[PDB]
Amino acid sequence: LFGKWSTDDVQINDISLQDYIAVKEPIVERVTNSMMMHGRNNGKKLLTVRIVKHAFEIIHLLTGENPLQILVNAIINSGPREDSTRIGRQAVDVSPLRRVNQAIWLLCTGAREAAFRNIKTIAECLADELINAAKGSSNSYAIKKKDELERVAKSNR
Amino acid sequence: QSVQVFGRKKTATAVAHCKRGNGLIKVNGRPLEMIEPVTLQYKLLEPLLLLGKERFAGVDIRVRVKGGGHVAQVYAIRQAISKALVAYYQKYVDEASKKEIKDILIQYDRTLLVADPRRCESKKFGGPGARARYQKSYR
Amino acid sequence: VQPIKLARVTKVLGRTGSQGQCTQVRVEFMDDSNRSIIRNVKGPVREGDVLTLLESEREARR
Amino acid sequence: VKDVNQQEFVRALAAFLKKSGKLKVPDWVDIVKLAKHKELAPCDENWFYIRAASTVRHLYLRGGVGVGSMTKIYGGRKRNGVCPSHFSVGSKNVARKVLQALEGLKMVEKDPNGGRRLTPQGTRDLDRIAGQVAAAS
Amino acid sequence: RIRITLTSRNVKSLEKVCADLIRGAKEKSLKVKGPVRMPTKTLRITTRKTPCGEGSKTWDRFQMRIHKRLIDLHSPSEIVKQITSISIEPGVEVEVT
Amino acid sequence: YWSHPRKYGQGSRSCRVCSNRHGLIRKYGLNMCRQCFRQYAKDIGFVKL
Amino acid sequence: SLVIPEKFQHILRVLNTNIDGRRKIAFAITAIKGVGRRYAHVVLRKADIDLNKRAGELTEDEVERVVTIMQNPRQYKIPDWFLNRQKDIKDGKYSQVLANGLDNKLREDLERLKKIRAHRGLRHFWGLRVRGQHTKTTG
Amino acid sequence: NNLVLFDKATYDKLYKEVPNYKLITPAVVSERLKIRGSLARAALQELLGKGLIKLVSKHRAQVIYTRNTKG
RNA sequence: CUCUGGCAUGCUAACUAGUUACGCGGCCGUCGGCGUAACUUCUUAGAGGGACAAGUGGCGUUCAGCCACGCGAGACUGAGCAAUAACAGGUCUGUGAUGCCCUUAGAUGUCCGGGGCUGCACGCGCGCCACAAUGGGCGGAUCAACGUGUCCUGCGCCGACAGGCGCGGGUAACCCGUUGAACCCCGCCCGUGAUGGGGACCGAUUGAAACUAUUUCCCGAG
């Protein structure tokens, strides 16, 4: 009657970002698939699961809450809200889904370049990206890209 | 007393046998707890985690799988033993007991009973694999 | 300066833009239905979805 | 033997073979690398006692295995340098001496069909070691 | 005691041979075994289409289907010569043992 | 004299039709040119599928 | 017992070659020419030295025994195939060369073919490579 | 810089700072104590027996330790 | 249309494919250990059943149809074949297809020997392998599909291994072979340092004629 965790009364505050409900009352599947990338990690799903399985441990031990409540909080606050196209520039709303797609792409890329030129474990940098992306710590990679795409959208409109 | 069904993901066929045993399942003599990968262990426990541990306590399951890879077999045997109990309850018990256990399995994952007809597409000349092509040189 | 307003898409008008990447739709607010504005959307959007527009002032000129 | 971890079994079986010094343990055990696809020497000193533990375990699963069939088990991805890597079999001598080391004990026997199989005594000690490791946890 | 094999390329000629062989032995009331189906063996030939060089790297992959059908019979070989003599069919080859 | 041993290497095998030493197809016992096997492919029993 | 000892030297000059005291007992001697990763793990195993140590943990007593096996390994049952030079051109004996020895040993073969004016020798003099392959575009 | 062995001066510094960290793993101890990875893994085995840290999960790729009895 | 993929405790079948009983032996249930009885779910491949926008709903003069949705092995997948007309596109080098021209004994005929086609200041293109943090290094332990085979290999013996010496099978669903593949998985080691990442270039074999080191094998350099 319970999955990998209990997840008693999962709360989804925003109505627009209420699409990933396959594990609620699968985002865990899409976060594992979006991690295996950058060429030399393709075709390794089990390798990313160990990274995610170790990521949930670091998240569960650093915060006294369910590990899934930090993953949803990261993509719901780091998701973009306006883009700039080539109109031949207008602040275009993306989607209720594009916010989920691009946010996960920024989380996997954030722990990637921050751990390439440094001696750090991927299982640690992934968990570090989630806690930094939540509430906008102003030091992560997804937030730095979200605020940059929103700043350029307001300028050229 | 005689139930044999096959579960196939891509090519691995797993023939699960369901006999009136005592309720201790094991893969061709090996218990299902020591089959690699260690992470892909809950997938074998899905017909026993979400399903109560009282219907399988009267049957014995010994499966034999051949073909495919590691992940192609771990998804094959979980489908083999799932369709095994639904066939035993059909031949000797009422369908109300059978239909009750089918709705609980499909509600979690559709691949537990329905087979996936997906196969690997053939390779076409001009590039690696089916779709991808070799790099074209202009001028 | 205007507050971040939420808006629910009531009917999609079709794909627009130069390369057909944007989707011009008409939105409908939930709190007060006394305002209706058309907004371009970049990405796959179903029927009845909710977008979060920031400006909520300028139009898209169809 | 199937009711226990196959890695914990080969580790517990490796101590049983080293406890009874009735093996061969040739002189060149620490100069040769275990296969041409490998590059350096093994890290563990008593690799011969661990190899003989896995060698006798495979005979329990399927009998009639020789030297040419054991080197196929212990094969890897040979780094061919700038050339794409491929599969290369192990060494026949290090596998033959292991099979000959088990012949000193009453664990393996040569079947007339070909290859090597297990003895009634070989399966006896193999199951008790699997039994004592199952009772460990 | 004798194993009759049927080596044929086209299935239409193969299925007709194994049909009359069972009926040709039925008139003697022999305990014959059903015809088994060996795995079909195809022969792959991936040839370049162009005769010499100039082209777009187009390969035409040929195939050659070789079908095998076995029929086992335990009966003396005293009068089986005429049973095989009435099994004439172009394109197929019978190799009794 | 006037007979050089040629049984291993390119020069002992040639096409059994045009007597050429390029594009040979000797798998399955054919020994034909790649530009000549296509001419008799329908006669041997090879069809495109 | 992970505390650093007083005899821990970061640099141990052996055979006019520096040895960093940071890596293991084997991969540190690899810096010396003529002794690689394969020859290091062997001479340390025949000397009965713990492989879980660093270059700074061996005192002068352990160092002299390691170098002794390196100079003349044939006396310690180290085979002849494992040696660098097996049949020398001027010596003719199985003796693995060392750092300061190989520079003079390889230049003899380069000068022998140069003095004798061989086709393989002139290529080392012209500044080109003795090709086992093509050199049309490879600079 | 980098250190392969342990120094007596920094030896006691590890017993008072590593058990105070929330995430105890060789990837973190290496960055904060300049340990070259290999000594960091063996150091946690010494701390595990003394009772300063406890093991929650051990794997060949990444091990995690927590604060011992802090609730 | 053809071919191929797809799913019936279905039909037709099986000692060159198995399964379930039973007997026997080993071991503390396990056993591709052995042997004969049932059977065709698994395997193989013969024919014929199945899928049509047929039912639901909506849209469209209501048609053509499209969209969504029951039920379902599919709301289907890839491939082969592919007109008319045309090109100074490629092919006289694949032909004993071939016009004309040239050569024809001191031969542009072809037999043999030697070398070149691999020769380098450089340019371009198709690829390989990397610049490792998601990796590399040593153990152990699980897994295959189209294939191929007179030449592929099996087992004993010897060998650092490439190999070598012996004994056998397979002209093949039979032997190789239950294709014990890598990636992946489980431990350990290494710790960002052109390092243990990357490898260029630089005596022991094997089929010959190792020149120009065919390539491999070991060590070192790298």
Ligand SMILES: [Zn+2]
């Ligand atoms: Zn020809």
